[PDB]
Structures are given as structure tokens and as C-alpha cells.
Paper text:
P26, a homolog of the viral-encoded nuclease poxin that neutralizes the cGAS-STING innate immunity, is widely distributed in various invertebrate viruses, lepidopteran insects, and parasitoid wasps. Recently, an immune nuclease poxin was identified in poxviruses to inhibit this cytosolic DNA-sensing pathway by selectively degrading 2′3′-cyclic GMP-AMP (cGAMP). Here, we report that a secretory baculoviral P26 suppresses melanization, a prominent insect innate immunity against pathogen invasion. P26 targets the cofactor of a prophenoloxidase-activating protease, and its inhibitory function is independent of nuclease activity.
Author numbering:
A (entry chain B): 18 to 208, 211 to 266
B (entry chain A): 19 to 208, 211 to 266
Write the structure that this text describes.
């Protein structure tokens, strides 16, 4: 297999897995690995930059929500896209959650969207800035949405959380009439003790939960994301910011 | 005797240059402007906490385009638009409460000096928040006033429980340094340098397990980094836009 080239990127197309593999950037060998929401926990990813959905030996710089980018298509042409939307994505590697709001572009033409392969280079002023990781067919917008992973854009939030649990992180939809405390979402009144008594009881009993297994939960709806870190049932921390969550 | 404006009953305290709100919506309330560190009274525990306040009344979400009216010491009101974003925080009983907040600016310092700590802030003739902190943004040459309450859309809020009795003291992130956990360091030694420090701390994670939890807030004009650490091991970080109200 001989490598194709575009701008500062040498790559190949893998038709079995329907992916693009980047072999060189700026004239040297790189490792750019698209991760699902959960990595394989390989030690060799430890020494790479992590942004949601990717572990990369190459820095992905900050983009804004107004400048045009060019994403490489399966046929060698490129699509001009403006990442003016905001979606949140995440992955877990070795008991560390990496999450961020990310600038996100949309493709209304699903013929073009199907030509965008996992791992496809995303260019800004003829230099690689990111690669295609995840996609989400948005019902309400009737468009396929593509986050552009990399360094946190201005006006958005990113973070990381170390936890203990081996089941990883699985986001859960926040049901109507429920509020979150720690690991749990509950209605205000009992039935289940109810969120107000639970939160008060968990805080009062802080010392019994000290040093127990740390769990991270991600509660989402269309409008809001809540991320909590808990030990036992005690909520060590919470973060709240705008959805949508790419999931 | 109490003064009354819209749904609020209040008094002006001249000795302390602050406004005390006694009633909202025909009932007795407790609205307490907190510094960056509360006195840790148990009576604040059952109140709503938003940065700089503990309040028995809900402060609803505001947007950054609609007009608000802040009550002045002379009984008149200033029309303000909270179009700016600042971050504020306070600590109550080893819990940090922080949030980006919609913030208005007063360029006229004579009017700003008529805005008192605790002054009611009105939206459509109903209390929505109160004046808490202010900041002379000598860059934009205006006095900035956060409007504390529920996190506005597009902004971030959070809370972190920690152990240390010394509270949280923000620190300016110096040029050429990067943060890991409790520390900001340059990349190369002279100490150990942040790259070597972060790797060693992550490798030695189990040696810091269950040690004292500290929260640090690292800031410059453009960015705020908030970390939670046990010993030197960074449990979590969050990064978002400055400025910090401090
Ligand atoms: Cl590049
Ligand atoms: Cl981060
Ligand atoms: Cl919060």
C-alpha cells in the first residue's frame, strides 16, 4: 500500500473498516487513534495527547466557531465546513474521563456525509488541525453533526476526572421530573427516598462514604449536561453546562 | 421603617453602606451576601447558594441580552444589560461554589458608587438577584457587577467538596507555566518542571490516595483552571474562559 498525500498529511484508505489511517504529518511518523467512548486502555496511548475521541501524537490546535475548515472525502475532494455548532463528547482511558464541548460542523447532504470516513483529516489553512472522530445524525436539525476534537475552543468548557470504577462511564438520560445528586437521579418526593432527603442524608453521612469507590456519571438531556464525581453516594463535585451530548 | 419597591421590602444601612432585604413576595427572607469565604454558619446550609450569596429565595436564570434594573441608594434605578461574562465563587463549609455569571458594567463611577452591596436587581418589576461583588476592570475602565443566580445558558457552573481548612485562594498563572494538580511550573526544572511532575504524580497515584483534598483556581485574563487534588495527585480539572472576579 502506497500512501496518498494531501497538504502536510500522508494517509491511506482502509475499505474493510471504512476508515482513513494517517501515517505521517509534517514529514514524520505519527500515531492518531480514534477512540470510541472507551479506549482499549493500552499503555501506548498514555504518552499521547488526549482530546475527546482521539489519542494523538500530534497537537490539535484550538479552532473557532466561525472560520472555515476543509474535511477530506473518500474520493480525494474536500468539503468546506464551518464548525458553528456546539456538541459535547468524551472518552475514558485508564479510569480517566476526558470530556469537552467542541466546535461541531453539520452536513445536510447525507451523500457527502457518507463520504466522510472515521479518521479523515480536517484542514485549516492547508494544515491538519484535527481528524473526524464521531458523528451524530441529528433528528431535529436533519443533518449529520461532526465534532472537531482538539483544544477547548474559546467560550467552551473542557475537563478531566480520575475515577475508580471498572464499568467505565455510561451516560444516562435525565428523566422528566428528576434532579441529580451524586450517582442518582430522583424525583423530589419519595418513590426510593427522593432527591432532597437523599442529598441531605448523603452529605450528613459524608464520613461513611470517604475513600469508597469513585464513580463518574453523566446526566443529559437536549438542554443540559450534568457531570458528577462521587465516592459511595457522596457527591464530591458537579459540573453543569449546555448540551447536546454526542451520544 | 422599611422601604418598599416592587415585590421587595428593604432598609439601607448607612453605617455599613449596604441594603438589607427583609421581605420578598410578602414573606420574610434571608438574603446574605457572602465574601469569597463564608463564616460557615449552619443557618446558611439550607439556603440556595450561588456565588457570593446564600438566599432563601430562588434567583432565576437570566440571559445576557434582556435589560435589568438595579436599585440605587437614592431610590432611583439604573437600567443595565448584563452582557459580559465573569466568574465568581465562594466557599461555605469546605464546598466551593463557582459559576460564570452574566455581568453588567457601569462606566459612570458616581452611579456605581450609588449601587450598594445587597441592592435588589429587578427584571420585569420582580426581584431576580442582588448586588454581591464588584470589580474595577481598569482595562475596560468600568465597574463590573456579576448578577448571581442560576447558571445562564452557554455558561458553566460547578461545585467541589474539599478538605483543607485554608479555603481556596486563587492564584495568577504566571507566564510560561502550566498547571498540574496543586502546582504551576515551567516545563523544565527550576523545581522539577511540570512535565516531570505530572508524570511522577500520576505514576505514584496510589501513594496520594485519601490524602488532604485541596482546590486551586489558576487564572489569567483569558482562562481559569480549577483543579481538585489529593496530596499532589490531580483528581480533576476543568478549564473555561476568564476573567475571574478577584
Ligand atoms: Cl498540522
Ligand atoms: Cl481539560
Ligand atoms: Cl452547579
Amino acid at each position: 500500500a502506497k500512501s496518498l498525500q494531501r497538504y502536510n498529511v500522508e494517509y491511506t484508505i482502509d475499505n474493510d473498516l471504512n476508515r482513513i489511517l494517517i501515517h505521517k504529518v509534517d514529514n514524520r511518523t505519527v500515531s492518531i487513534n480514534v477512540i470510541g467512548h472507551q479506549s482499549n486502555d493500552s499503555d501506548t496511548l498514555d504518552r499521547l495527547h488526549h482530546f475527546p475521541g482521539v489519542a494523538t501524537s500530534v497537537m490539535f490546535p484550538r479552532i473557532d466557531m466561525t472560520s472555515a475548515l476543509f474535511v477530506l472525502l473518500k474520493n480525494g475532494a474536500m468539503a468546506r465546513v464551518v464548525p458553528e455548532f456546539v456538541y459535547t463528547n468524551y472518552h475514558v482511558h485508564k479510569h480517566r474521563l476526558v470530556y469537552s464541548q467542541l466546535a461541531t460542523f453539520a452536513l445536510e447532504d447525507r451523500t457527502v456525509a457518507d463520504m466522510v470516513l472515521i479518521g479523515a483529516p480536517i484542514f485549516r489553512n492547508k494544515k491538519l488541525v484535527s481528524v473526524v472522530t464521531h458523528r451524530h445524525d441529528d433528528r431535529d436539525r436533519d443533518a449529520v453533526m461532526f465534532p472537531v476534537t482538539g483544544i477547548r475552543p474559546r467560550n467552551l468548557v473542557s475537563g478531566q476526572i480520575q475515577f475508580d470504577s471498572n464499568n467505565g462511564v455510561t451516560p444516562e438520560r435525565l428523566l422528566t421530573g428528576r434532579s441529580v445528586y451524586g450517582r442518582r437521579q430522583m424525583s423530589y418526593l419519595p418513590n426510593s427516598v427522593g432527591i432532597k432527603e437523599f442529598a441531605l442524608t448523603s452529605v450528613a453521612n459524608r464520613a461513611t462514604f470517604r475513600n469508597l469507590t469513585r464513580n463518574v456519571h453523566i446526566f443529559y438531556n437536549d438542554d443540559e449536561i450534568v457531570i458528577t464525581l462521587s465516592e459511595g453516594e457522596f457527591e464530591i463535585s458537579r459540573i453543569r453546562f449546555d448540551g447536546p451530548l454526542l451520544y
